[PDB]
């Protein structure tokens, strides 16, 4: 007597938001950008190759200095690399070898890591002693942790395969906010450059925009046909990109609350493992699972170039904050840094 | 290349040495993945071999270290993390052979071992598991023996002649589970009926693992 009425009201509201989305779709970004010149063929050559991992590599993050980077792997080791000199600053052993995410504190003082043990553990890199020690061990998620990202030296927000994103306080050690709006497993995270909003891509083929201070879903962005595997913000902070199994990227906009462009190709049929932007937003480095990575013109959906130096599928890739280089990890236990 | 950078490079070299030592020590370890319906006598086999997150069990039999990942504690989507275990020597699949008269509580519209049959079908011909062999454990032997008198196997499998005897029914069930193998040219299925003596099951797992290792070595050398 009430479930049917609520379902009908929800359907009516969904139809209303779809009509509102279609009302402000007078022009399309795909045809607006015919005036600008094409970016043209772009050649990127692998400058460095960080070797020393002996298992699958599932995560990597770039330090704010854009010279140090942490990398996770399934052999149970966490390695901090010096990209310029390709030497190991640290080699952190992990209690659980099933880690599938890692992050770097913006200050560079701490590093996080998590995985099938559903624990994002924080390691203190700068101690009075000479070793790295586990600063904190956050627990409370139900499913495996797919991503935790450092808000600052004291805050971190994690996404887990229990259809939930949580915001923690490192000192006390328990989450202070919870973001329960998703239906499928949450698989990716991306903090806005001003670190006030973040979007999370789940398995229900939808990306939602939250507010850290409030704790509520501001917007929900749909349009994919499979589970979203990669989430990345536009450098401006007023858009983002999604990557799923349907072999298709999508650029969404926060202000108009609708999709702008899709990056699909007929010959590419396999999904997307990781998606990142460039320093200005003209490039979109989407890492597919056809044993290489692709580069897109973010304003015209034109395939600018490829990065085809990996003997396995790339599972993670990010771009330096200063925009000098691009590093892509893969399942061949090999990390490569491009330019 | 100043003194500081030279010392940093020496530190990196020592890190590499320790990493290589740890990796070569880890390469001597047999990594096994344990799956099943969950209430299929899995704990009995786990405790026989012993003598949130994913549970880990470690033991040695004959100078060989076994690592056994119990992954049943995760209720997320299987495809989202099954590629983590893509490199694994073998998969242990415990099957209970005394639950044809019992149905799952949540749905009660499908038989108990039909769910395990679907799980085996999904696991056997996965994209990642096209090479890893499967060790099958048919646990509830005594319960099957004492329960087949009350009810025959025709209820679970309608296309049955109806011998209603333990040996032929067990052969039927083993053949049915082996029939789900689609890539018959790449992986084998090893089947054992869980015995009272705890050494025999471990010996059978050891033999299956050494067969897998021999085949992998032959493939690496080329002959396979």
């Amino acid at each position: 007597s009430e479930l049917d009425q609520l379902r009908q009201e929800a359907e009516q509201l969904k139809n209303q938001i779809r009509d509102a989305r279609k009302a402000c779709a007078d022009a399309t970004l795909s045809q607006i950008t015919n005036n600008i010149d094409p970016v043209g063929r772009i050649q990127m050559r692998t400058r460095r190759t960080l070797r020393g991992h002996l298992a699958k590599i599932y995560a990597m993050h770039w330090g704010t200095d854009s010279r140090l980077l942490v990398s996770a792997s399934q052999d149970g080791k966490l390695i901090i690399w010096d990209s310029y000199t390709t030497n190991k600053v640290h080699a952190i052993p992990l209690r659980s070898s099933w880690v599938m995410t890692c992050a770097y504190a913006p200050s560079g003082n701490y590093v996080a890591c998590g995985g099938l043990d559903n624990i994002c553990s924080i390691y203190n890199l700068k101690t009075r002693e000479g070793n790295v020690r586990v600063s904190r061990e956050l627990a409370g998620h139900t499913g495996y942790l797919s991503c935790c990202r450092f808000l600052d030296d004291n805050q971190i927000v994690t996404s887990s395969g229990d259809t939930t994103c949580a915001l923690w306080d490192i000192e006390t050690g328990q989450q202070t906010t919870t973001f329960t709006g998703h239906t499928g497993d949450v698989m990716s995270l991306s903090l806005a450059p001003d670190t006030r909003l973040f979007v999370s891509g789940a398995c229900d083929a939808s990306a939602k925009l939250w507010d850290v201070r409030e704790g509520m879903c501001r917007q929900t962005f749909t349009g994919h046909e499979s589970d979203i595997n990669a989430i990345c913000f536009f450098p401006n902070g007023n858009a983002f990109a999604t990557g799923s199994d349907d072999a298709t990227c999508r650029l969404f906009d926060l202000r108009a609350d609708q999709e702008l462009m899709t990056y699909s190709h007929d010959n590419i049929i396999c999904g997307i493992t990781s998606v990142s932007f460039s320093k200005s937003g003209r490039l979109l480095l989407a890492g597919y699972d056809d044993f290489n990575c692709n580069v897109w013109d973010a304003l015209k959906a034109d395939r600018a170039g490829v990065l085809a130096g990996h003997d396995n599928r790339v599972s993670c890739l990010g771009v330096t904050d200063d925009g000098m280089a691009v590093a892509t990890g893969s399942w061949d236990s090999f990390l490569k840094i491009w330019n | 290349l100043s003194a500081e950078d030279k010392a940093a490079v020496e530190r990196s070299k020592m890190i590499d040495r320790n990493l290589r030592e740890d990796g070569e020590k880890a390469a001597r370890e047999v990594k096994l993945l344990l799956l099943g319906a969950g209430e299929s006598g899995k704990s009995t086999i786990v405790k026989q071999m012993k003598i949130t997150g994913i549970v880990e069990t470690h033991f040695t039999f004959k100078d060989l270290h076994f690592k056994m990942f119990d992954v049943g504690g995760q209720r997320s989507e299987r495809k989202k993390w099954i590629h983590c275990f893509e490199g694994v020597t073998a998969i242990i699949f415990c099957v209970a052979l005394s639950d044809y008269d019992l149905v799952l509580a949540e749905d009660e519209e499908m038989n108990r071992m039909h769910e395990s049959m679907k799980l085996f079908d999904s696991i056997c011909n996965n994209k990642w598991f096209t090479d890893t062999s499967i060790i099958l454990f048919l646990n509830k032997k005594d319960l099957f023996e004492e329960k087949i008198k009350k009810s025959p196997l025709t209820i679970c499998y309608p296309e049955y002649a109806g011998s209603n005897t333990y040996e032929e029914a067990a052969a039927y069930i083993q053949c049915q589970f082996e029939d789900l193998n689609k890539r018959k040219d790449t992986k084998e299925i090893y089947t054992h009926f869980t015995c009272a003596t705890d050494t025999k099951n471990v010996q059978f797992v050891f033999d299956a693992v050494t067969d897998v290792i021999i085949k992998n070595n032959l493939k690496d050398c080329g002959l396979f």
Partner: single-chain antibody
């Protein structure tokens, strides 16, 4: 709290032999590279010997090469200095100094208490203009030290370290690579330099800010210190 205790010495007849031992328990010792730095009475510091992490690299000073032998026992967390054929100019307070080398580290971070020893009776050189300057408290004071050759490398960082020795205390690191303020010191200190001529600036003096300041190069061995600069309130 880290500690570096050391025992040995007290009296040696000329031409003898003595062994100095350093003990650093409770904290990492295998990763840290260890140095010996001596300081003759009423004289500036002088690097003596260095051993790397894992004992895989050992250096000695020009005036001690062949007569001294530095060894470490990582399982026991001990550092040794086998001294043979001790002269009458070897009388000095010997210090145990730890140093860790990776990208962004702070070597020469912690100095031991120092054990005395009395024996009864080409390379970049630094230069400090003054050795005694009186400044009233609350006023800024600048201390500058030059070098024989420029310390700025292709890496982009120039290797210059600043140490302060309080009266009757071990020297402590406050600035490394001319800019990085070492952890544990107040923010009133600051450092700058241009290739060859460097300096150090204090925002305001304090009762504990008076002492002797040394500047050291780390571009390549042997490490050369500078003549001490005494500050009197």
């Amino acid at each position: 709290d880290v500690q570096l205790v050391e025992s040995g010495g007290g009296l040696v007849q000329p031409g003898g032999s003595r062994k100095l031992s350093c003990s650093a328990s409770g904290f990492a010792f295998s990763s840290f590279g260890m140095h010996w730095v001596r300081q003759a009475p009423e004289k500036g510091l002088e690097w003596v010997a260095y051993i790397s992490s894992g004992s895989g690299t050992i250096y000695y000073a020009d005036t001690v090469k062949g007569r001294f032998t530095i060894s470490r026992d990582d399982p026991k967390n001990t550092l040794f200095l086998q001294m043979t054929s001790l002269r009458s100019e070897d009388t000095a307070m010997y210090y145990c100094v730890r140093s860790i080398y990776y990208y962004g580290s702070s070597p020469f971070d912690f100095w031991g208490q120092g054990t005395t020893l009395t024996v009864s009776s080409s390379d970049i050189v630094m230069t400090q203009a003054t050795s005694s300057v009186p400044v009233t408290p609350g006023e800024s004071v600048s201390i500058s030290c030059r070098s024989s050759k420029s310390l700025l490398h292709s890496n982009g960082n120039t290797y210059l370290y600043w140490f302060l020795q309080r009266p009757g205390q071990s020297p402590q690191l406050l600035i490394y690579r001319m800019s990085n303020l070492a952890s544990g010191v107040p923010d009133r200190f600051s450092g700058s330099g241009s290739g060859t001529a460097f300096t150090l600036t204090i925002s305001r003096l304090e009762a504990e800010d008076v002492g002797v300041y040394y500047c050291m190069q780390h571009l390549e061995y042997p490490l050369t210190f500078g003549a001490g600069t005494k500050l009197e309130l």
